[PDB]
Design a protein around this ligand. Structure first.
Ligand code: EF2
Ligand code: ZN
Length: 112
């Protein structure tokens, strides 16, 4: 669609690991962005993606405190540097799985 796009790929902000792409943004409940808080009171602006790479999913899934009805989550770390980038969601419906990534922990930039 455009030549030399600068808003193509999302990398880990801390190390540059390739994580996702703007093309893979997923409008869960009508919006790719969901503003949420955890039990420790931390607020996250979470962007939902159909796909991601370069992460390491830690532990078994849990349904507790899930921000997305019908989904269980696993912590998603940057597979390169260990930065906590978000969560992988599974066990739900349409889609069965997706990633919720913390927007401000990613850097956006040109394709590879
Ligand atoms: O969908 C989710 C993902 C996990 C997230 N969450 C956290 O970020 C957290 C931090 C410490 C203890 C417990 C939790 C927890 O469930 C949360 O609250 N909802
Ligand atoms: Zn990283």
């Amino acid at each position: 669609m455009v030549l030399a796009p600068g808003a193509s790929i999302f990398r880990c902000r801390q190390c540059g690991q390739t994580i996702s792409r703007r093309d893979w943004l997923l409008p869960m409940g009508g919006d790719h962005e969901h503003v949420v808080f955890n039990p420790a009171g931390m607020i996250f602006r979470v962007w939902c993606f159909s796909l991601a790479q370069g992460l390491r999913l830690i532990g078994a899934p849990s349904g507790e405190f899930s921000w997305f009805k019908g989904y269980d989550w696993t912590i998603a770390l940057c597979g390169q540097c260990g930065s906590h980038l978000g969560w992988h969601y599974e066990g739900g419906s349409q889609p069965q799985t997706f990633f919720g990534l913390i927007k401000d922990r990613l850097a956006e930039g040109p394709a590879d």
